[PDB]
Amino acid sequence: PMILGYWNVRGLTHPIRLLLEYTDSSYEEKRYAMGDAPDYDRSQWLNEKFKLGLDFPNLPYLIDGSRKITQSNAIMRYLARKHHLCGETEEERIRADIVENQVMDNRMQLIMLCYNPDFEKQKPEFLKTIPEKMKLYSEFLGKRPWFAGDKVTYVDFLAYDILDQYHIFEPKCLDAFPNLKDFLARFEGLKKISAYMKSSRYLSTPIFSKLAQWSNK
Amino acid sequence: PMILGYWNVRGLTHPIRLLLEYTDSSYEEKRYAMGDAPDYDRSQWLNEKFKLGLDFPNLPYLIDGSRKITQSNAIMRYLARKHHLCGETEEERIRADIVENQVMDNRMQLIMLCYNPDFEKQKPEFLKTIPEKMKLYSEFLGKRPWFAGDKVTYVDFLAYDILDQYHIFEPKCLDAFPNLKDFLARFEGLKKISAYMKSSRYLSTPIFSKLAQWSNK
Ligand SMILES: N[C@@H](CCC(=O)N[C@@H](CS)C(=O)NCC(=O)O)C(=O)O
Ligand SMILES: N[C@@H](CCC(=O)N[C@@H](CS)C(=O)NCC(=O)O)C(=O)O
């Protein structure tokens, strides 16, 4: 089988776990654990970081036979090409390129606030900003059923993830965008997905390490 | 022609400027300026940020007639596809994806150092880490002429830039790494790049905005 390695956290690997399932990949995961405070030992990983033969060692990684990959986006694109889940048209490619990089931006912003020592001070001004981030998702999708077009592509996995996360963080952030909420239910309703969500392998939380101030446990 | 817009800095757009020159593209630039401390006015951009028809307004943006794109990597890929500078085989495609992503991480690490009020006391820890980053790019290029393989692809633009920037930060960081000093000279040796480095348009520094602690003027 293929081997997925990551922390025993949702982090940024939710979209890869979901694509592996949707595509019926035959895989196993090694979920590394971080020691507890104060130290938050990372030795379970560090001990083999440089022994897997990865060009640029990092988590997540994917071993797929003789193919070895790091960087979540490259893993996602690798799977997308393997299982034909890319945009077919120039327009679809442009939309997937954009979204793919927009979700990373929006992710880094959440990670930054979340691991910010002044998280409580920070919520307030950060939440005033969500509505305009959702609007931009909302208008981009418009009436299309999926982000690049007429077909589910790997970016739907990235966009579902990030929208789901913003929603955990601000339950009402989406009341004003029925099309986003509609997107989250169309996505949760794909066949292998609904099944994966009721399984032992499913991990929606925690999101971050115990380092976090949010969704850290 | 095509319109590229970004700040009047190198920032994260050096690779696009290079790619437009290497490909003999017809293009005009809009270089936005920002005020000086203490409030660093961004009003030149802000006045037109929501007036361009951009899906997710941001800098850099590229406009190619109908097509309006944001996110640097999406602009890079659009230019790559147009001018056939994409990997050709799967092996080239994975190497491209990884590098693209590895570049952005190494770039985010430098930006975070450089925008930390603690620059000076923090810098010496940052320097200790460089040798290991460069060894990774080094062992990855190996003996290949270019990053994805035997031909220049869009990723050599992303790689030239991040090696060039770290090289400006630590002039001696590449001494142990011949294939990289060499890569730097092969790239610069490209006809249209060599031509462009001497032109009126060339903008090497500053790299960061007036806010940074390093290379801000
Ligand atoms: N940009 C990388 C993020 C890599 C990264 O930041 N990995 C964190 C987990 S989110 C890590 O623990 N890295 C392993 C390491 O550096 O040793 C990706 O998108 O895959
Ligand atoms: N992930 C984006 C980063 C973009 C970004 O943060 N843009 C900066 C300059 S590097 C900016 O000034 N944005 C202007 C704004 O927010 O209105 C990219 O790769 O293009």
Curated annotation (Swiss-Prot), chains A, B:
Role noted for this protein: Conjugation of reduced glutathione to a wide number of exogenous and endogenous hydrophobic electrophiles. The olfactory GST may be crucial for the acuity of the olfactory process. Participates in the formation of novel hepoxilin regioisomers.
Residues with PTM Phosphoserine: 66, 204, 209
GO biological process: cellular detoxification of nitrogen compound; cellular response to xenobiotic stimulus; glutathione derivative biosynthetic process; glutathione metabolic process; hepoxilin biosynthetic process; nitrobenzene metabolic process; prostaglandin metabolic process; response to amino acid
Annotated glutathione binding sites: 6-7, 42-45, 49, 58-59, 71-72
Protein name as it appears in the record: Glutathione S-transferase Mu 1
GO molecular-function term, one example from the UniProt record: identical protein binding
Family stated for the protein in its record: Belongs to the GST superfamily. Mu family.
One of the record's GO cellular component terms: extracellular region
EC numbers: 2.5.1.18
Domain GST C-terminal stretches: 89-207
Name of the top EC class for this enzyme: transferase
Keyword annotations of the record: Cytoplasm, Lipid metabolism, Olfaction, Phosphoprotein, Sensory transduction, Transferase
Catalytic activity: RX + glutathione = an S-substituted glutathione + a halide anion + H(+); prostaglandin A2 + glutathione = prostaglandin A2-S-(R)-glutathione; prostaglandin J2 + glutathione = prostaglandin J2-S-(R)-glutathione; prostaglandin J2 + glutathione = prostaglandin J2-S-(S)-glutathione
Subunit annotation: Homodimer or heterodimer.
CDD domains (UniProt xref): GST_C_Mu, GST_N_Mu
